[PDB]
Amino acid sequence: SFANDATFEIKKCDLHRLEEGPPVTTVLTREDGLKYYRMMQTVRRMELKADQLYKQKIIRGFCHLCDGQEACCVGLEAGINPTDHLITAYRAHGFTFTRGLSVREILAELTGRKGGCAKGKGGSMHMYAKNFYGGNGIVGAQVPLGAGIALACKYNGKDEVCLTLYGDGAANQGQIFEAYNMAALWKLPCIFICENNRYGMGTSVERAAASTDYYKRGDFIPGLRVDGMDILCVREATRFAAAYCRSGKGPILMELQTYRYHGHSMSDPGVSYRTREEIQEVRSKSDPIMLLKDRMVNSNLASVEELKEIDVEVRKEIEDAAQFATADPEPPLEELGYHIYSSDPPFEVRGANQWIKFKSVS
């Protein structure tokens, strides 16, 4: 027998130009708890499998993993509606999953097969879904885009909001400050979110920003700092920020304090700019899956066995998806030129020489 729900204390958020922030207690139901655990574990195992596939040369090029930040993508999704919009950068395997795509389609895209979500045209960095305006490879570029999506939300008067995520490294991009100004000036329903994983590739926040209070960079825009290792903190902070935007009070900044277990990308071991002890200290003290597990077990919301069972189902699913991604055939060469233009009559595009022609269909 289990309790149907329980009440938890969550960390208070540091505030900037706000009298009150999100509440410091929240109610978690058993069913919601189980869902969040499964989701986070799914993202986790997917990333670990991607790491395995990259080392076997089945994934090439870029491959940015997000394990350690599972509370972020799952937290944000928990505090928003499917009708809401979200955009981020290249570290988007989790968000792709939380926003609807299957681990099959995500892995098949990473392995560059026809069964991918973009038919293998995209790879790790470029995946799109329902109200998910993708990962973007140009640092900062997605922030104006997000405010643009926010502008459409207000323009259509549908009471939807847009989450626009960027990293600590991105936080120093000029276009972001141009976006603050306009989003504030027009009162756009935009939630600027800075995922702070302490590093911008190989550069720590201390060496990259004169002020490391990312929730304050907005200046005239009000902000708040959240514990990005706590699923429940993020969820509650997100519901607050979304409410703030839905009421028409304009944009707002949200700094998520999180962490990544892998280096920047697969081409970066991540040991030259940080210690192995630092990583281990976060994993044994603040692992987002461990935190949730402890909460649910200690409050009689779920059992240790029930959760280990979920772990087993999730690992198997990931195993089955990886076999599909590895065995699925590459895109047919005849479709190289497809999807250059939308809503256009077919035409032909030049290949490596003038005698090579590829058909282009919308």
Partner: protein, 330 residues
């Protein structure tokens, strides 16, 4: 009867498209309350208001990014750069966020946006304000680039650009804004469109093919008038579209005329003329050239301020006539 300036033609175009689709809107610096930096958007803010016609602060990368975002979200924005010299700040949004997105998404995400504004040489504005960007934007797959000349071109292309579900770059011309043209009844109609990708023969001829785009088209027609008094009949082609350009039309023309001269305002190296010439050599019309194709372009320098110098950094009628006479060996 009824003279309409290129400026008013563009205004007319955006006005009709704004009324037709509530999802279309205009943004940029001074577009609303100031009535347009070059008075192109005159009366529009009065007619449509704060929601549809939006003044922006001076933040190119920012408001171009916002425009693309709105487009991805289902809106159909018209993003104005006060001149295309200023587009360089936001060119990453144009190329990387807009042009390539549909392809990278595998056909799941279209970007129905239009970037417009005056491009190229003006009068005495010096090096940082005179740059032509036709070749830069024409270089990139996923874009469509057009470059109107007269009032018909401007209105037809701007409406086609807007109705096109892709990023279309409309390179306008500041010196052309004030010039009036006979606006036939067909162009006054709300369904007047010019297909992106089709060239136009502004003058039938048999002796030499003269291809151009934007303002110097008018200069080609002046040159052709002079040469006609000497027995030389030039076929003047107005490109209209930079990408995808209309080589078929040029080829057929050179097939008849046996000679070719390209005329552009921009810099020569890796310019519009270079591609036209490279294509003519590679194509089925090369055997029909009785003389090498030559290029008339602007001088290979940053735009100088001084009048006598600026005059010689831009193709003049006499420079076009000189090149034509060299090819015909007369």
């Amino acid at each position: 009867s009824l003279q309409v300036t290129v400026r008013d033609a563009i205004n007319q175009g955006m006005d009709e498209e704004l009324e037709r689709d509530e999802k279309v809107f205009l943004l940029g610096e001074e577009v609303a309350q100031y009535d347009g930096a070059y008075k192109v958007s005159r009366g529009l803010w009065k007619k449509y208001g704060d929601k549809r016609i939006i003044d922006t602060p001076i933040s190119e990368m920012g408001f171009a990014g916002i425009a693309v975002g709105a487009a991805m979200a289902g809106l159909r924005p018209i993003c104005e750069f006060m001149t295309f010299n200023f587009s360089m700040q936001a060119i990453d949004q144009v190329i990387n966020s807009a042009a390539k997105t549909y392809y990278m998404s595998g056909g799941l995400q279209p970007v129905p946006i239009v970037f417009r504004g005056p491009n190229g040489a003006s009068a005495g504005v010096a090096a940082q304000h005179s740059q032509c960007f036709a070749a830069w934007y024409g270089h990139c797959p996923g874009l469509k680039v057009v470059s109107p000349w007269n009032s018909e071109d401007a209105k037809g292309l701007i409406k086609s650009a807007i109705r096109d579900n892709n990023p279309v770059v409309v390179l306008e011309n500041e010196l052309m804004y004030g010039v009036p043209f006979e606006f036939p009844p067909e162009a006054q109609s709300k369904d007047f469109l010019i297909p992106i990708g089709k060239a136009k023969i502004e003058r039938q001829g048999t002796h030499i093919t003269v291809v151009s785009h934007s303002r110097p088209v008018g200069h080609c027609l002046e040159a052709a008038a002079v040469l006609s008094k000497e027995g030389v009949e030039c076929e003047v082609i107005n490109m209209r579209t930079i990408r995808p350009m209309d080589m078929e039309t040029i080829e057929a023309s050179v097939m008849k005329t046996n000679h070719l001269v390209t005329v552009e305002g921009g810099w020569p190296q890796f310019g519009v003329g270079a591609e036209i010439c490279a294509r003519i050599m590679e194509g089925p019309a090369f055997n029909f050239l009785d003389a090498p194709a030559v290029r008339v372009t602007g001088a290979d320098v940053p735009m100088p301020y001084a009048k006598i110098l600026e005059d010689n950094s831009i193709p003049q009628v006499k420079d076009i006539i000189f090149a034509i006479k060299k090819t015909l060996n007369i």
